[PDB]
Amino acid sequence: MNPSTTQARVVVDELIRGGVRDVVLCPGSRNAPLAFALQDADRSGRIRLHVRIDERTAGYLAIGLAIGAGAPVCVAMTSGTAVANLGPAVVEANYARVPLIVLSANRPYELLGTGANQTMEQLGYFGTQVRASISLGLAEDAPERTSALNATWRSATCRVLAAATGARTANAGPVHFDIPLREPLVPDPVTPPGRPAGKPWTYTPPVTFDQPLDIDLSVDTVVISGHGAGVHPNLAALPTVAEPTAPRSGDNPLHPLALPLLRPQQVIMLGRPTLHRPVSVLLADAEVPVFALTTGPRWPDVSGNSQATGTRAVTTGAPRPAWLDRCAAMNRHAIAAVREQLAAHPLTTGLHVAAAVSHALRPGDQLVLGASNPVRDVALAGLDTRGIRVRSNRGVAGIDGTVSTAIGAALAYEGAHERTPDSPPRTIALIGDLTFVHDSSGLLIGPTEPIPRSLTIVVSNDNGDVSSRIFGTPHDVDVGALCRAYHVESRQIEVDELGPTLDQPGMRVLEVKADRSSLRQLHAAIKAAL
Amino acid sequence: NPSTTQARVVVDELIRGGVRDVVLCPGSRNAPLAFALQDADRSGRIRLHVRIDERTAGYLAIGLAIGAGAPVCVAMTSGTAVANLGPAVVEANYARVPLIVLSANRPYELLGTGTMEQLGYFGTQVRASISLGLAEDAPERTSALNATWRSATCRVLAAATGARTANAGPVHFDIPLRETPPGRPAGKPWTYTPPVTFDQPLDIDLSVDTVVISGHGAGVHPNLAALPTVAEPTAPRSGDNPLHPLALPLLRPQQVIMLGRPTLHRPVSVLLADAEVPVFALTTGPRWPDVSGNSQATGTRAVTTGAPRPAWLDRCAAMNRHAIAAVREQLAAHPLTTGLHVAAAVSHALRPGDQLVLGASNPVRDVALAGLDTRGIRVRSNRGVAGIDGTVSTAIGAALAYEGAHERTGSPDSPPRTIALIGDLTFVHDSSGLLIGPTEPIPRSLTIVVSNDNGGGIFELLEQGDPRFSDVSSRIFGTPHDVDVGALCRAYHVESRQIEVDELGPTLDQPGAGMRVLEVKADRSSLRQLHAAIKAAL
Amino acid sequence: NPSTTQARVVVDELIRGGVRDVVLCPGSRNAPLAFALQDADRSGRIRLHVRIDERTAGYLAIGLAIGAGAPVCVAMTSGTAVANLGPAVVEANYARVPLIVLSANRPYELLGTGEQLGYFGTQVRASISLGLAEDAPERTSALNATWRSATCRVLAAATGARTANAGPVHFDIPLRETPPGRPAGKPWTYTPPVTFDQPLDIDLSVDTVVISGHGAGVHPNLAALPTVAEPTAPRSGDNPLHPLALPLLRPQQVIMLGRPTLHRPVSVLLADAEVPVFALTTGPRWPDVSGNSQATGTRAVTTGAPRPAWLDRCAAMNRHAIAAVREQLAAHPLTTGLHVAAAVSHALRPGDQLVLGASNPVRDVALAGLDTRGIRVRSNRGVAGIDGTVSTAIGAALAYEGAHERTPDSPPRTIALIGDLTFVHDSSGLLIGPTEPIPRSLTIVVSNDNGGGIFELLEQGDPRFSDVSSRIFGTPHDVDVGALCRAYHVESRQIEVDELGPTLDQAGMRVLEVKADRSSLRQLHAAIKAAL
Ligand SMILES: Cc1ncc(C[n+]2c([C-](O)CCC(=O)O)sc(CCOP(=O)(O)OP(=O)(O)O)c2C)c(N)n1
Ligand SMILES: Cc1ncc(C[n+]2c([C-](O)CCC(=O)O)sc(CCOP(=O)(O)OP(=O)(O)O)c2C)c(N)n1
Ligand SMILES: O=C(O)c1cc(O)c2ccccc2c1O
Ligand SMILES: O=C(O)c1cc(O)c2ccccc2c1O
Ligand SMILES: O=C(O)CCC(=O)C(=O)O
Ligand SMILES: [Cl-]
Ligand SMILES: [Mg+2]
Ligand SMILES: [Mg+2]
């Protein structure tokens, strides 16, 4: 067995032993040792392989596969710009804390500078965005040292996995794992074994990261939970303004529109609040003390008056019953204003589409939102997220790869369900037309590749500085033709067919035509009803 | 406002420096120098191109720079911009393209607490990173600040065009911001850089049986024009004695003159690696390539003694004829249409004055296998890193700049044609480069020929294309996708037609929309057999 | 001036964050926070230390941090400062030292037209810039809050307050050429104590040996196990295992604490594919020799008990090893570095701080079987450089003294043991102006064998390299150590090895030089191996 083949199979085996169940693969000659090894691991059921053409959107497919089931996901590609194309997904994975392993092939470092074709400054390309950039090193031709090389290769692989999952740091994130490979790259015309019982070479258990923080709940308190927030049972009774991706620890919801009309004496901040301007405006009021509770070492700088950080609260006291009544009444008032104006508005807007999707969902659903207006609109409509997994690329809230993220979240979620009978759970994506068109090529799944069992992509189509001149005109891109180009079933429907159509039992796109013209008066009328 | 003066001063100097096109994207915040650029665009002093896709925008800038050799600016607006600009910036570094990346950092705002998202590649790819510094409000010091700003902008331009280094490439230019003073007379740049020559003569004796291999970035060498030359399509041809790359292993050169950076043909890299063959590397810039460390000397031009043997010149010319005949005759006998057939058809239908944009993978090779005579043609390809990413926007930008050059010549004549030949994978990779708003510049004579064999044909020709891998190679190297290319063009309102290879020539001979896609369905399951028959007919 | 307000706020918050010492050098431009730092030093709120040599100033800051565990700042002022601070910053990263590097970039000036290197990207826990101070008194409260939280962020990353991985941080406060903090002196953003918990199941009935290196944690439930401890490694119990006993025993499993760097037998054991090695660390990083770590955690969950036979054999081989070193030392006719180390170990009392140079000194102190219980031991094991050790000793003594005097009695002793090459490397650290703080009970003991003794013990020390190894590895210098201490007005004395104990029992800063021999070092160590 030649060295490139041997090294690639040890690495793939250790990655599977480390809990990698899905791998995204992109084509190239230099990464042939990785592709062959990943191929026959897929053939023997060890992993699910996903081949894509476009490295950039492929990274967001890997992200989707990671957030959909919570497991580390590798994306493998060849040397050169194929590695650079992972930049966008790496930036998002860094801020969203996603265990994304960029498993790049390379030519031997000894050829960098020689002018060799398709060779670049690959190691360190991502700089500070990854948790680590680890090079495996060139596989030596030395049979007598096969047991030594097997130990170093496997140990390096667990380092990559641990950095990516935050096994010891509590801060998952992208890792660059660069594999210099040289010919022969294809199997020549047994692989060094790992630990017994399928154990990882270096076992590191998930650490428990604890920083208790004393907080008095008697002071009038509002909880604001953003992306990456944890669950806090002792904060469940408090009024909570929760982003759609934040897990609702309790059942005392507070609409984001209600918060500006309330006067909290202190704020408990869960995770990283990324979305609401009213949230930011209260946090930028330096005079209300903010307590930062996070699941990892990072904590948000959004308030300048963050008195303290921690992982959990040690609560004394109890919220004033009058305070709870007031906020609860303001929450119902805010959500009544939204629903009544929506019903009085004559035209279907993106908020109507968003409200319609939120009503269609049921516990067990997975909802994927494009990171601009859809996550805002769903939040405005007052989506009750208890019992449903909401996913969104809120690390940088970029537009790239949204379709691919939804396809990946569906696949990992469904596959988690077929490791337990009943019909696979529903994944419903809500993305706007510009984002859909922008990552429309993320729809492309090869005829030989896994197709989501139950993904429905709802496109809320409202047909849309001198750089902003390109929004001065509707693009008028034919959504149906786009889905035809990537052979995906599509149907243009109306907002009240949405509920029934979603209840109609593989992967499909439902396009709902929406008006953007009157959106200002819809929102103005909602501000007035408060 | 000091910042607003500063932007007009910089933009004026960028225009005086030869920048004719700037590419912007919508983003988190305002573009660097956006209002100054808008003023210049409205005045016709500069042409702006807006895209939503930051990755395709970077390669659009590549095309706008290589189509006519001008420095090109790209304006960053976002927190994914650096990431999306990465691939094109690396290509600009390796292909020596004058790409100016503009930023507007905010020195009054916090940093490191969570807009610039630095990666690691800027410190390895750019010729320079220059920051103007915040614009002081000091009306008294106006003449001095003007001089400082225009001097720095000239320094940015010189780094990008290689004015003093002969190594063009990407430059990071930052104009900081907190949220017109004249230049030189007669539109001359503030700091002038006259022609520079780097001269490294090498003594080479041409009586030794010599072959010339010219790759990307190769210079023109009149004293090597007689020698047998194995030229890449982007290599400018000095002379008259083409040597087909497939005739190379049927000859025994005693010495090789290497021009520029070759990246094509395994027989080229074998011969370049042959310890017994002296290899002389002639480049136009400070870098020089090697295969296996087998380069004996490196220079910029040759000082030649002697002449090649007649029998050696005849023998190469005969083997050249055999290779071309094997290709034409085996192609004719082949039952299915392949990408090599499409490339042969495109080559025949090319006229002088045309610009040819070649995608990576098989198209740039197949065009060489078809014996295309590139003289009179301007051939572009991203040989820098040989990506299949960004090729649609490279062809579009190259056609815009090449047509802009021609419209600027004042000639009352239809603009020259830009013909692109790319694979199906390459097309899908940069499909979103086809989305151009009506507000933006669109080519007037761009045709993109898409050779569609529903996957990556080049791998049928590699070791993983051997029949012993038939079971597994289809999925992980072939990567079929079944994309309806016609519908994809339909979606972006791009004229397209699906034709057979024999109709390709006449279709190219008749004009249509300014931007159009010609799709030729092709087969790759017989590609390995076809190439096998060519070698056996050699 | 908004910038002056900014600098004062930052210094005030750095004070509340436990920074008691700041190190400065004079430079082309004026130092960052220089005026605010001056007022703090005049008020006794902080203590300034000024040096000319920027490289020794970096290691002085390292010493001021490891001496009492406090965050220390260094004030960059020049175009050579980043280059000169490089060594210290790399050491601060690997040894996990809370070092804050202050910078003051000028955003109104051109950059890139004619002083960074490549190491800041790979070494620092964080790089944070404050941004220019806006002239807006309307928002004075909001700016005060923003500046103070950032400083807390810088302090948090430097001390490992949330990562459990202290290290160097780059803190930039730009400028162009006092609002209150929290009540009761509390930090603006308070980070309570953090635990990272990674329990490992360890069966102690299996013949187990403990190897503790730099940064090792304390483990009560492992106190009884035979423990091969490094000098800087805190001791959990009282069952020491000499490093020389290890190659004669056959442990069935190894518990590895912190980061070992010493002893070739330790590496062979940890690299043994048939011995499971469990790595217990206090931070996220973990070490491996030849990729032979079975698991990593922060603490052990123990089942079973070591076999009495196994304990007794290890303890027996400990006495065999230690007695063999002591006996071969007394039989040796010449004073060597090992002799000087043993003399120093015998002279140490609880409450002392012992600072150890690299090369033989830090190895010899273990071979001499120093009992480190009750003694703080410092060595720059992060990169094991022989650079900067004098100012590392000085800064550790200043900080250790400072901590004791914020409690009566005479300040505790700080005793340093360094080879001659180490001493000459950082000789400029002895240059201290009469305006600067000077330690009160610091004794630097230079074991001078006129070259690198450690290279006598390696492959290049074989007699077949007699002809060539003396120049390229021995590197003798013939330096007059006494004249060098005289030049800097440092108290010096050249004494024999049996004067060491008494002389250390008697000036605030003094050097004791003990002339030593490396000509016979290889034969001496051979005699110990022989008698083992
Ligand atoms: C972004 C990116 N990602 C992956 C690669 C690797 N790659 C190539 C390479 O081998 C190119 C080598 C050369 O010198 O041209 S060539 C290739 C297949 C391209 O298929 P295609 O566009 O349909 O062309 P075809 O006619 O099928 O050869 C792939 C996937 C790449 N070059 N760029
Ligand atoms: C700045 C620098 N430059 C070179 C080295 C290499 N080096 C060392 C090494 O071998 C280090 C080994 C260890 O783990 O301590 S040890 C060493 C000799 C030190 O001589 P010394 O101070 O007189 O010690 P001695 O007691 O004579 O062994 C040298 C030259 C270094 N460590 N740092
Ligand atoms: O809590 C989280 O998950 C989280 C994640 C992040 O990526 C952050 C980035 C900067 C600042 C705070 C962050 C944060 O609190
Ligand atoms: O000749 C050229 O244009 C050229 C361009 C490059 O990007 C090179 C990179 C490495 C080594 C040689 C190179 C080279 O010779
Ligand atoms: O596919 C090819 O032939 C070129 C790609 C290459 O050289 C590589 O393996 O990196
Ligand atoms: Cl021959
Ligand atoms: Mg193809
Ligand atoms: Mg010595």
Tab-separated table of C-alpha atoms in Angstrom, chain B residues 46 85 92 98 117 130 233 245 261 271 303 332 351 354 360 397 414 427 470 475 501 511 526:
chain	number	residue	atom	x	y	z
B	46	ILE	CA	-14.449	55.746	-14.922
B	85	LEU	CA	-12.078	38.000	-2.607
B	92	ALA	CA	-3.826	37.888	-9.130
B	98	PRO	CA	-2.755	44.491	-11.232
B	117	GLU	CA	-12.566	40.114	8.726
B	130	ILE	CA	-0.661	50.918	2.095
B	233	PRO	CA	-2.311	29.041	-25.564
B	245	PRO	CA	3.028	18.971	-27.161
B	261	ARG	CA	5.557	29.600	-16.162
B	271	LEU	CA	11.398	16.749	-19.974
B	303	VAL	CA	22.446	35.877	-26.068
B	332	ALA	CA	-12.757	12.332	-37.460
B	351	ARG	CA	-10.110	35.204	-36.569
B	354	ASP	CA	-10.426	37.873	-31.438
B	360	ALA	CA	-9.099	25.360	-16.900
B	397	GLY	CA	-14.636	41.329	-17.564
B	414	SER	CA	-17.928	46.415	-34.757
B	427	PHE	CA	-19.758	26.986	-16.112
B	470	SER	CA	-14.516	2.254	-13.146
B	475	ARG	CA	-19.007	9.482	-8.453
B	501	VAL	CA	-20.174	20.601	-32.948
B	511	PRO	CA	-23.826	37.390	-34.178
B	526	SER	CA	-15.002	7.609	-24.626
